[PDB]
Swiss-Prot record, chain A:
GO terms for biological process: negative regulation of transcription by RNA polymerase II; nucleolar large rRNA transcription by RNA polymerase I; ribosome biogenesis; termination of RNA polymerase I transcription; transcription by RNA polymerase I; transcription elongation by RNA polymerase I; transcription initiation at RNA polymerase I promoter. Residues 1-64 are annotated as: Necessary and sufficient for recruitment into Pol I. This is DNA-directed RNA polymerase I subunit RPA12. DNA-dependent RNA polymerases catalyze the transcription of DNA into RNA using the four ribonucleoside triphosphates as substrates. Component of RNA polymerase I (Pol I) which synthesizes ribosomal RNA precursors. Besides, RNA polymerase I has intrinsic RNA cleavage activity. Proposed to contribute to the polymerase catalytic activity and form the polymerase active center together with the two largest subunits. Subunit RPA12 contributes a catalytic zinc ribbon that is required for RNA cleavage by Pol I. Involved in transcriptional termination. It comes from Saccharomyces cerevisiae (strain ATCC 204508 / S288c) (Baker's yeast). Keywords: DNA-directed RNA polymerase, Metal-binding, Nucleus, Ribosome biogenesis, Transcription, Zinc, Zinc-finger. A zinc finger (C4-type) spans 9-32. Residues 1-59 are annotated as: Interaction with RPA2. GO terms for cellular component: nucleus; RNA polymerase I complex. It is found in: Nucleus, Nucleolus. The chain holds residues 2 to 65 of 125 of the full protein.
UniProtKB/Swiss-Prot annotation, chain D:
The gene is RPA135. Three distinct zinc-containing RNA polymerases are found in eukaryotic nuclei: polymerase I for the ribosomal RNA precursor, polymerase II for the mRNA precursor, and polymerase III for 5S and tRNA genes. Present with 14100 molecules/cell in log phase SD medium. It comes from the Eukaryota. The chain holds residues 59 to 172 of 1203 of the full protein. This is DNA-directed RNA polymerase I subunit RPA135. Component of the RNA polymerase I (Pol I) complex consisting of 14 subunits: RPA135, RPA190, RPC40, RPA14, RPB5, RPO26, RPA43, RPB8, RPA12, RPB10, RPC19, RPC10, RPA49 and RPA34. The complex is composed of a horseshoe-shaped core containing ten subunits (RPA135, RPA190, RPB5, RPO26, RPB8, RPB10, RPC10, RPA12, RPC19 and RPC40) where RPA135 and RPA190 form the DNA-binding cleft. Outside of the core, RPA14 and RPA43 form the stalk that mediates interactions with transcription initiation factors and newly synthesized RNA. It is found in: Nucleus, Nucleolus. Belongs to the RNA polymerase beta chain family.
Swiss-Prot record, chain F:
The gene is RPA34. Present with 3360 molecules/cell in log phase SD medium. Belongs to the eukaryotic RPA34 RNA polymerase subunit family. This is DNA-directed RNA polymerase I subunit RPA34. DNA-dependent RNA polymerases catalyze the transcription of DNA into RNA using the four ribonucleoside triphosphates as substrates. Component of RNA polymerase I (Pol I) which synthesizes ribosomal RNA precursors. Besides, RNA polymerase I has intrinsic RNA cleavage activity. The heterodimer formed by RPA34 and RPA49 stimulates transcript elongation by Pol I. The lineage of its organism: Eukaryota, Fungi, Dikarya, Ascomycota, Saccharomycotina. The modification Phosphoserine is found at residue 33. It is found in: Nucleus, Nucleolus. Component of the RNA polymerase I (Pol I) complex consisting of 14 subunits: RPA135, RPA190, RPC40, RPA14, RPB5, RPO26, RPA43, RPB8, RPA12, RPB10, RPC19, RPC10, RPA49 and RPA34. The complex is composed of a horseshoe-shaped core containing ten subunits (RPA135, RPA190, RPB5, RPO26, RPB8, RPB10, RPC10, RPA12, RPC19 and RPC40) where RPA135 and RPA190 form the DNA-binding cleft. Outside of the core, RPA14 and RPA43 form the stalk that mediates interactions with transcription initiation factors and newly synthesized RNA.
From Swiss-Prot, chain H:
DNA-dependent RNA polymerases catalyze the transcription of DNA into RNA using the four ribonucleoside triphosphates as substrates. Component of RNA polymerase I (Pol I) which synthesizes ribosomal RNA precursors. Besides, RNA polymerase I has intrinsic RNA cleavage activity. RPA190 and RPA135 both contribute to the polymerase catalytic activity and together form the Pol I active center. In addition, subunit RPA12 contributes a catalytic zinc ribbon that is required for RNA cleavage by Pol I. It comes from Saccharomyces cerevisiae (strain ATCC 204508 / S288c). Belongs to the RNA polymerase beta' chain family. Present with 2840 molecules/cell in log phase SD medium. The gene is RPA190. It is found in: Nucleus, Nucleolus. Transmembrane segments: none annotated. This is DNA-directed RNA polymerase I subunit RPA190. Component of the RNA polymerase I (Pol I) complex consisting of 14 subunits: RPA135, RPA190, RPC40, RPA14, RPB5, RPO26, RPA43, RPB8, RPA12, RPB10, RPC19, RPC10, RPA49 and RPA34. The complex is composed of a horseshoe-shaped core containing ten subunits (RPA135, RPA190, RPB5, RPO26, RPB8, RPB10, RPC10, RPA12, RPC19 and RPC40) where RPA135 and RPA190 form the DNA-binding cleft. Outside of the core, RPA14 and RPA43 form the stalk that mediates interactions with transcription initiation factors and newly synthesized RNA.
Length: 64, 49, 108, 105, 172, 114, 229, 89
């Protein structure tokens, strides 16, 4: 299973580490020999946002 | 604006929203020495200041 | 509109699995239930070679806040009493206990 | 009350000795013994030379303290509590304020 | 901290304080403010609370300001939305001064918090133990003596004499 | 296999489930135990918060909740459960049945004394 | 500058302090208190120490039906990576406790016959959120889970600072309850002074066994009994 | 002033007398060449990512409309072009 930018599994019920800091195409659980990823990892797409909150001006006082 | 970086596989996720924010409030569009904002006050006693 | 309770019973013979969002259910080993009888609680076990199903019921409010489950097309529902169940699956991670201390010297 | 229930949760404390028994010839170093406190209660004050009743205003007639007196139960254990060499010892005193539970008012 | 604060409506003196160095430090209590000395020794504060419309403890996994986490004093088994928050904010205030409560004591501290302002954290808070601080007040539906502490004084308000009472902007 | 649950399950029964993909699907609800599973055998089919039922306490409140849990099917006896799946097994609309313990209504007559 | 705290209280009213601290790196650390000695620590090693949660239930406690917030996943997966850095062979609560036996053997003054599993649960349940009660295995995640969603929500701005300087957040030390606190403390220094008289004999030597009961009465009264004094 | 060995100060200040002829309406325009404008004064939102190719990172800024920083702080592309491959990078 996958949430955010990271992959969990089904047998072991949990995650694994950074898939590129360890071997790509060759990953499993961090504690049990429960190799659920079959090297079809993820599409790593996260999108964050700074919400323009501590950018003071005289022209953000007008939008307020 | 738009610009895309690349980075090696070893270094982890970082503060990508804070890797920009603290840079912006220190970055400057024109430097001007030791001086911040100019106020236009009330005239007083025969002199505009 | 309105609808009627068809079938009440005596023993509830179902539970839930409250694992987490998205346990995609391998169903590679279907496990058993260990009863109770307090009233209306259950508990479970289930074996793999490296993995054990450990699940009991919350004694704070289990039969005192009793779900049921319904079924309809006919379009008339029937009750079916539902014991909820909390679960935390375990795996083979034993055997650390052989040498916990500094037993080699241990005179410190 | 509280401090009865206070020193309730205490487990099995220890202090050990240097007297052996007979691999683990140096493992089981000696008497696994314990110490615990089960009961403590100031009751009331008194004064004598049986017992009599003291007045609280009398205790500051005398330019002194309002000296109570305090008991303390000691529960003994050794080797999972197989002989409980029990004892009860006081601890001197404990002053109480006026109109309390454990005063005369 | 040396200045008087207007969250202190009716717990300590606005008027008694010495003049000089302990100004704003030491200032005694009010007239009829009281201190609880032992708990709501019932353990059925939650035992009716899941009945009254609250989901159980470890079966849903919701958290955050999007829900109002029902803090029993210490324990939690409850989180709700505000649409069950304002109900159980003062449904208790219907039960609390009502004699059909063998489990809900007269002395109990229920403060509500809505998710307005993005200010305080959203919850449904219960207290009442040792060192709990009191003051009694007149709850207007079924006018009866009722105690509150300072944690009620944020999001549920008091009128000062029944002429400034007006439509659904006071309750006490 | 530690505790003392006093029993091991043998007595099992059947679930009504068609497996037709109009469509018999499961329907779980939430309500306490001090309820009418012994004394009122009927409850509506309503929308978001659209009832107040009638017993001696004279309030039950069907709620909705959409915005989970794996479901187990003890089909025959010796299995004691399974995990229900058409191909997990999802679900449409859960209820949480409270009791509208109301407030005494609008009164500003006696309490507003001149 | 961030931090949310608990002044957790024992059911005999002698408290402690359990703050958090917001490491600007992207981890988060505790703080305790002791004799005059602060003991900070990372959080997952005594998050995932209570009962067997090594799965999504670590993550699924943080909000489950709102994953869509983007302050979450880029900030919870740097503290969780701030622990797999330390020991990747650490997965069940037998093994997670075992680190306490390197440090917490001689800091809470334990026995030398006690293995760490007897003391690590013991050093846990003396110092952090005692008011959820002993045997709080289910009931120390679900506090601390909720306790850390606040601190992330206190840096992301959807919360606000509290006012400890007001009657908003005021209690009373009753004076008699405080007087009933010292008689939890000075009872457990009188008890901590008969176990400072036995070993000052047996390591001086010539200290016979207690089984003859006058060894008690030669050790139980040589210590001064001055709780009242 | 008297005791603290006055130095780099909290409120720096000096008074600039303007001429007899310079206007109300031209002086303040050249007061906006004086005012130290930060770089963050021109952004609606900063949406940033962490993708993966081999780790990939695209920053996709959003600015205002042109006629505000050109208006309110009297500066435009004359240094916003050469702040964005020269200073911020
Ligand atoms: Zn695995």
């Amino acid at each position: 299973s996958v949430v955010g930018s990271l992959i969990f599994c089904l047998d072991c019920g949990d995650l694994l580490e950074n898939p590129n800091a360890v071997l790509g195409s060759n990953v499993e659980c961090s504690q049990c020999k429960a190799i659920y990823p079959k090297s079809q990892f993820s599409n790593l797409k996260v999108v964050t946002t700074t919400a323009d909150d501590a950018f003071p001006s005289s022209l953000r006082a007008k939008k307020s | 604006c738009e610009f895309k970086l690349e980075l090696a596989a070893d270094t982890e996720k970082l503060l990508m929203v804070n890797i920009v924010e603290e840079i912006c409030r220190k970055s400057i569009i024109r430097q001007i020495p030791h001086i911040d904002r100019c106020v236009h006050p009330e005239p007083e006693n025969g002199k505009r200041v | 509109s309105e609808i009627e309770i068809e079938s009440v019973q005596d023993q509830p013979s179902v539970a839930v699995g409250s694992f987490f969002k998205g346990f995609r259910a391998p169903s590679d080993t279907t496990f058993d239930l260990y009863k109770k009888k307090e009233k209306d609680e259950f508990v479970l076990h289930g074996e793999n070679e490296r993995l054990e199903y450990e699940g009991y019921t919350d004694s704070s409010s289990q039969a005192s806040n009793q779900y049921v489950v319904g079924l309809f097309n006919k379009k008339s529902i029937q009750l079916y009493k539902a014991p909820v169940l909390v679960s935390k699956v375990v795996s083979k991670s034993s055997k650390n206990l052989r040498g916990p201390k500094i037993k080699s010297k241990s005179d410190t | 009350g509280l401090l009865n229930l206070g020193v309730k949760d205490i487990g099995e404390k220890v202090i050990f000795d240097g007297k052996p028994l007979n691999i683990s010839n140096s493992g089981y170093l000696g008497n696994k013994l314990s110490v615990s406190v089960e009961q403590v209660s100031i009751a009331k004050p008194m004064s004598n030379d049986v017992e009599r009743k003291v007045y609280p205003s009398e205790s500051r007639q005398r330019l002194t303290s309002y000296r109570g007196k305090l008991l303390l139960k000691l529960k003994w254990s050794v080797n999972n509590g197989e002989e409980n060499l029990f004892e009860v010892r006081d601890c001197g005193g404990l002053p109480v304020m006026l109109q309390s539970n454990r005063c005369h008012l | 901290v040396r200045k008087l604060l207007p969250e202190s409506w009716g717990f300590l003196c606005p008027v008694h304080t010495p003049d000089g160095s302990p100004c704003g430090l030491l200032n005694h209590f009010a007239h009829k403010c009281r201190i609880s000395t032992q708990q709501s020794d019932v353990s059925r504060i939650p035992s009716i609370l899941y009945s009254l419309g609250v989901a159980p403890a470890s079966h849903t996994f919701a958290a955050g300001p999007s829900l109002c986490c029902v803090q029993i004093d210490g324990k939690i088994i409850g989180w709700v939305s505000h649409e069950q928050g304002k109900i159980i904010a003062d449904t208790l205030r219907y039960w609390k001064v009502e004699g059909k409560t063998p489990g809900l004591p007269i002395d109990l501290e229920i403060g509500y918090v809505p998710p307005s302002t993005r200010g305080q954290y959203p919850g449904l808070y219960l207290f009442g133990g040792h060192s709990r601080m009191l003051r009694p007040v007149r709850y207007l539906p079924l006018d009866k003596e009722d105690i509150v502490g300072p944690f009620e004084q944020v999001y549920m308000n008091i009128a000062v004499t029944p002429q400034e009472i007006q439509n659904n902007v006071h309750t006490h | 296999s530690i505790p003392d649950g006093f029993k091991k399950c043998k007595h099992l029964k059947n679930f009504p489930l068609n497996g037709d993909n109009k469509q018999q699907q499961v329907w779980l609800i939430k309500f306490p135990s001090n309820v009418d599973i012994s004394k009122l055998k009927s409850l509506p089919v309503d929308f978001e918060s659209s009832t107040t039922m009638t017993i001696d306490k004279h309030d039950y409140k069907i709620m909705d909740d959409t915005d989970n849990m794996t479901l187990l099917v003890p089909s025959e006896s010796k299995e004691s459960l399974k995990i229900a799946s058409t191909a997990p097994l999802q679900f449409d609309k859960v209820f949480s049945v409270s009791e509208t313990a109301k407030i005494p209504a609008i009164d500003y007559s006696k309490v507003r004394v001149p | 500058h961030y931090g949310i705290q608990i002044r957790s209280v024992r059911p005999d009213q002698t408290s402690q302090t359990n703050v958090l601290h917001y490491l600007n790196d992207g981890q988060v650390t505790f703080r305790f208190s002791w004799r005059k000695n602060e003991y900070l620590v990372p959080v997952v090693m005594i998050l995932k120490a209570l009962c067997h949660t090594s799965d999504r239930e670590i993550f699924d406690g943080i909000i489950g039906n709102d994953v869509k917030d983007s302050f979450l996943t880029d900030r919870l997966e740097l503290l969780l990576r701030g622990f797999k850095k330390r020991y990747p062979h650490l997965q069940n609560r037998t093994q997670v406790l075992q680190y306490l036996g390197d440090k917490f053997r001689v800091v809470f003054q334990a026995s030398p016959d006690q293995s760490d599993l007897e003391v690590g649960q013991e050093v846990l349940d003396r110092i952090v959120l005692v008011h959820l009660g002993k045997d709080g295995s289910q009931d120390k995640f679900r506090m601390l889970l909720f306790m850390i969603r606040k601190l992330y929500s206190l840096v992301a701005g959807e919360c606000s600072p509290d006012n400890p300087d007001a009657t908003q957040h005021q209690e009373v030390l009753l004076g008699g309850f405080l007087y009933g606190m010292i008689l939890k403390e000075k009872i457990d220094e009188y008890l901590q002074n008969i176990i400072a008289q036995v070993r000052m004999d047996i390591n001086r030597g010539m200290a016979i066994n207690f089984k003859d009961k006058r060894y008690m009465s030669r050790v139980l009264m040589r210590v001064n009994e001055n709780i009242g004094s | 002033i008297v005791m603290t060995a006055s130095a780099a100060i909290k409120t720096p200040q000096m008074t600039l007398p303007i001429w007899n002829d310079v206007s109300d309406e031209q002086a303040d325009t050249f007061c906006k060449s004086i005012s130290k404008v930060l770089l963050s004064e021109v952004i609606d939102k900063v949406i940033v990512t962490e993708t993966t190719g081999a780790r990939s990172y695209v920053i996709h800024m959003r600015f205002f409309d042109n006629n505000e920083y050109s208006e309110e702080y009297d500066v435009s592309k004359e240094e916003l072009q050469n702040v964005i491959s020269n200073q911020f990078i």
